[PDB]
């Protein structure tokens, strides 16, 4: 379908469309060594990708409909020079006619313009004065569709944000090339992450976009909070969606003690820039391979869970033969787990679900999804098979619904 | 460089009756400290930590705090005057 399909293959970024347009990468473009399709652009002239399109598919019309798709991870704004500093990141403008994706404090912007000095903007706005955002420094799926008889539409994660009229225009003559580059950005330490860039020769409908959202989401590989692949031997701070103003703690190590949800998790704050909930809080987990035989955590991968207390690595375990419905979890010293239950099946989907860790015994029986429960007003981490049971034919948020947060330059909080 | 600076230091118990101006405090710890009628003016705090602290008639005027944590402090709005925070974590009073 695609007239442009920017994809990384072998050791080069290419167009997977028949038009096989030529791509001119700069000296200072970074690729994620784990997913090279994840592209990192800096505020440096050399950090730029240029697509030199074939002259056929070049847009020069007043009635041809088109759409553009991509995923983007936009790090949090840290500085005040970036408030009201709109900066272009993708550009197909030739003599102020064509289109461009631009960014600015709390906004992703789309602009079309014709040969006769008339434009139109659609804008998705997001806040940074917010406890837990869906949009700050997290891979979001942006899709922009255009119909010349009516409107331009801005969809985020499959869902319509805004629509603005473009029937007044206007023959548009776009550039012969697309420039991926931050242009006009006054924040010297600034970047974006970009991946899966597509162009389409029509206005996509609202089902085609949901479908593209669902396939490019890599159902089958667990993700962290930010959207990247979940990894082994990598510390993650833990976020419980059911109760997000609480962080994980251990009162004491050993089958004596318990892991629990402690509150209130605090805030991070830059004056006039952001006020958020703190994400780097409490005991870190590390996902350990059960089978040492690639550090990407995939659906149905049997693992252990390590736990860091006072700088030392422990083990998440429980006795499921204990009396009651929920089996309370403890952080065990590792050479002393014995035959307690500790092996965890990691879950991406069934179908997707935020409920990620299913606790088992050593003979293949479900102990339950790791979550929490209130005992004597102490929200202790437990496993329970109620979780596994509400997950039949529902997809709502539960106390087993978790998010893994590693330290990241886009968030910029002090780790502790 | 060309500004007063006092770094890698841990103050353990109590501070009373001092008006500190023009200082940069780089990675300093204030842990278990009681402040009594202490005043920091026109100063900069970088990668420091406030932990289990108490403050009586003390104030931070025209101070920039960078990368610092306030953890179990008694700090209120009316203590920081014409203030600024930058990547500062707030843990609860
Ligand atoms: Cl938002
Ligand atoms: Cl929104
Ligand atoms: Cl904001
Ligand atoms: Cl996931
Ligand atoms: Cl996510
Ligand atoms: Cl132990
Ligand atoms: Na947000
Ligand atoms: Na990860």
UniProtKB/Swiss-Prot annotation, chain A:
It is a multi-pass membrane protein. Changing residue 414 to S: Decreased binding of RBD to SV2C, substantial binding to neurons. Residues 372-373 are annotated as: Interaction with host ganglioside GT1b. Changing residue 412 to Q: Whole toxin has very strongly reduced toxicity, almost no binding of RBD to neurons. Disulfide bonds join 355-400. Changing residue 373 to A: Strongly reduced toxicity, heavy chain has very strongly reduced binding to synaptosomes, decrease in ganglioside GT1b binding. A motif (Host ganglioside-binding motif) lies at residues 384-387. Changing residue 412 to R: Nearly complete loss of toxicity, almost no binding of RBD to neurons. Responsible for host epithelial cell transcytosis, host nerve cell targeting and translocation of botulinum neurotoxin A light chain (LC) into host cytosol. Composed of 3 subdomains; the translocation domain (TD), and N-terminus and C-terminus of the receptor-binding domain (RBD). The RBD is responsible for binding to host epithelial cells and transcytosis across them; this uses different receptors than those on nerve cells. RBD is also responsible for adherence of toxin to host nerve cell surface; HC alone prevents uptake of whole toxin by neural cells, and delays paralysis onset by 75%. This is Botulinum neurotoxin A heavy chain.
From Swiss-Prot, chain B:
Residues 1-93 are extracellular. Residues 47-91 are annotated as: (Microbial infection) C.botulinum neurotoxin type A-binding. N-glycosylated. Upon expression in a kidney cell line the most abundant glycan on Asn-62 is GlcNAc(3)Hex(5), while on Asn-87 and Asn-93 the most abundant glycan is GlcNAc2Fuc1Man3GlcNAc3Gal3. Both Asn-87 and Asn-93 have a high degree of glycan heterogeneity. Changing residue 89 to A: Decreased molecular weight probably due to glycosylation loss, decreased binding to BoNT/A HC. Changing residue 87 to A: No change in interaction with C.botulinum neurotoxin type A heavy chain (botA, BoNT/A HC). Decreased molecular weight probably due to glycosylation loss, decreased interaction with BoNT/A HC. Glycans are attached at residues 8, 12, 62, 87, 93. It is found in: Cytoplasmic vesicle, Secretory vesicle, Synaptic vesicle membrane. Belongs to the major facilitator superfamily. Interacts with SYT1 in a calcium-dependent manner. (Microbial infection) Interacts with C.botulinum neurotoxin type A1 and type A2 (BoNT/A, botA). Interaction is improved by glycosylation of SV2. Plays a role in the control of regulated secretion in neural and endocrine cells, enhancing selectively low-frequency neurotransmission. Positively regulates vesicle fusion by maintaining the readily releasable pool of secretory vesicles. This is Synaptic vesicle glycoprotein 2C. It comes from Homo sapiens (Human). The lineage of its organism: Eukaryota, Metazoa, Chordata, Craniata, Vertebrata. The gene is SV2C.
């Amino acid at each position: 379908t695609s007239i442009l399909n920017l994809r990384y293959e072998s050791n080069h970024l290419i167009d997977l469309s028949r038009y096989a347009s030529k791509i001119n990468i700069g000296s200072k473009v970074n690729f994620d060594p784990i997913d090279k399709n994840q592209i990192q652009l800096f505020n440096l002239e050399s950090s730029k990708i240029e697509v030199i399109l074939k002259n056929a598919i070049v847009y020069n019309s007043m009635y041809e409909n088109f759409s553009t798709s991509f995923w983007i991870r936009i790090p949090k704004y840290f500085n005040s020079i970036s408030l009201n500093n709109e900066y272009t990141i993708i550009n197909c403008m030739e003599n102020n006619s064509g289109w461009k994706v631009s960014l600015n404090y709390g906004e992703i912007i789309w602009t079309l313009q014709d040969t006769q000095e008339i434009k139109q903007r659609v804008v998705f706005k997001y806040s940074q004065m917010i406890n837990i955002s869906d949009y700050i420094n997290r891979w979001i799926f942006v899709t922009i569709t255009n119909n010349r008889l009516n409107n331009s539409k801005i969809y985020i994660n499959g869902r319509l944000i805004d629509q603005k009229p473009i029937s007044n225009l206007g023959n548009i003559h776009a550039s012969n090339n697309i420039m991926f580059k931050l242009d006009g950005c006054r924040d010297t330490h600034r970047y974006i992450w970009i991946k899966y860039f597509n162009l389409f020769d029509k206005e996509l409908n609202e089902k085609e976009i949901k479908d593209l959202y669902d396939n490019q989401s890599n159902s089958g590989i667990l993700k962290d909070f930010w959207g990247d692949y979940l990894q082994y031997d990598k510390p993650y701070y833990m976020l419980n969606l059911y109760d997000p103003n609480k962080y994980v703690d251990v009162n004491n190590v050993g089958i004596r003690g318990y892991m629990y949800l402690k509150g209130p998790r605090g805030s991070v704050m830059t004056t006039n820039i952001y006020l958020n909930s703190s994400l780097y809080r409490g005991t870190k987990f590390i996902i350990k391979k059960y089978a040492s035989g690639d550090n990407i955590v995939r659906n149905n991968d049997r693992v252990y869970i390590n736990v860091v207390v006072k700088n030392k690595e422990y083990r998440l375990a429980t006795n499921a033969s204990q009396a009651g419905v929920e089996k309370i979890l403890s952080a065990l010293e590792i050479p002393d787990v014995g035959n307690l239950s500790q092996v965890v099946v990691m879950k991406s989907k069934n179908i997707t679900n935020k409920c990620k860790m299913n606790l088992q015994d050593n003979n293949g029986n479900d102990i339950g999804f790791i979550g929490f429960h209130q005992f004597n007003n102490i929200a202790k981490l437990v496993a329970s098979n109620w979780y596994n049971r509400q997950i039949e034919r529902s997809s709502r948020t539960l106390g087993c619904s978790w998010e893994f947060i590693p330290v990241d330059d886009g968030w910029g909080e002090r780790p502790l | 460089v060309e500004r007063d600076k006092y770094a890698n230091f841990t103050i353990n118990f109590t501070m009373e009756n001092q008006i500190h101006t023009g200082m940069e405090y780089d990675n300093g710890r204030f842990i278990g400290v009681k402040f009594k009628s202490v005043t920091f003016k026109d100063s900069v705090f970088k990668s420091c930590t406030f932990e289990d602290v108490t403050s009586v008639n003390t104030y931070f005027k025209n101070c920039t705090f960078i990368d610092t944590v306030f953890d179990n402090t008694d700090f209120e709005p009316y203590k920081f005057i014409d203030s600024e925070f930058k990547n500062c974590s707030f843990f609860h009073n």
